[PDB]
Design a protein around this ligand. Structure first.
Ligand SMILES: CCCCCCCCCCCCC/C=C/[C@@H](O)[C@H](COP(=O)(O)O)NC(=O)CCCCCCCCCCCCCCC
Length: 206
């Protein structure tokens, strides 16, 4: 179920507005399952996400586990212990900070795409909704060859009508309602993460 995956972002926050890593990885694994379902054309995207989730699971499961309970703890820990490459990637190519940043940026894209689906004409193409949202967000961080591969993948997507109907939550009007319910949770996780990275000047980690 896609609704279950999207609303599971609700579990990432707590009363202290910590962004909890376990639930964050869980939600992303849900998104990976979606990506795998879409087929081999999207496999390069799934593989990159999985690669990053594995980095995070190794950090969260290892000797330093406690420091990775939340994004807030991870930032304080990696900064205190000099585990983040601020300018170019040298001895710390795969810090939790730089790794989560890539997933974070993709969450903004996901937000934009879900809003596009929600507000789109009945006769829209999902390729265009993806392209518009991508060119408006993630595209800025990807080199031309990656932007081309992404664009190619996008063009294989079906009409909006088909894409919504495939979510199996009723008529598009109801799938639109469902997206409206998940979005606030994703937006809030994004906003809290964005402020955390911004306040530590980490928005442009290499
Ligand atoms: C139908 C939706 C199709 C999914 C399209 C997602 C478009 C975004 C594609 C970006 C993938 C980029 C491929 C690899 C880029 C990497 O170089 C770069 C990593 O940097 P690094 O090299 O610095 O370590 N990676 C990134 O930018 C991370 C990209 C992760 C994108 C996650 C996409 C989320 C997929 C979930 C979609 C579910 C939609 C649900 C609608 C019901």
């Amino acid at each position: 179920n896609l609704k279950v995956v999207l609303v599971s972002f609700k579990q990432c926050l707590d009363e202290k507005e910590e962004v909890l890593l376990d639930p964050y990885i869980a939600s992303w694994k849900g998104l990976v399952r979606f990506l795998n379902s879409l087929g081999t054309i999207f496999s390069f995207i799934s593989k990159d996400v999985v690669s990053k989730l594995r980095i995070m699971e190794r950090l969260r499961g290892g000797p330093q586990s406690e420091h990775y309970r939340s994004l807030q703890a991870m930032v304080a820990h990696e900064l205190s212990n000099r585990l983040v490459d601020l300018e170019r990637r040298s001895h710390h190519p795969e810090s939790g900070c730089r790794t989560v940043l890539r997933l974070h940026r993709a969450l903004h894209w996901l937000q934009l795409f879900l809003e596009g689906l929600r507000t789109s004409p009945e006769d829209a193409r999902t390729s265009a909704l993806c392209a518009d949202s991508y060119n408006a967000s993630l595209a800025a961080y990807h080199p031309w060859v990656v932007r081309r591969a992404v664009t190619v993948a996008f063009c294989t997507l079906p009409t909006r009508e088909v894409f919504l109907e495939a979510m199996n939550v009723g008529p598009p009007e109801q799938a639109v309602q469902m997206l409206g319910e998940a979005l606030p949770f994703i937006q809030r996780v994004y906003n809290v993460s964005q402020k955390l990275y911004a306040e530590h000047s980490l928005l442009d980690l290499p």
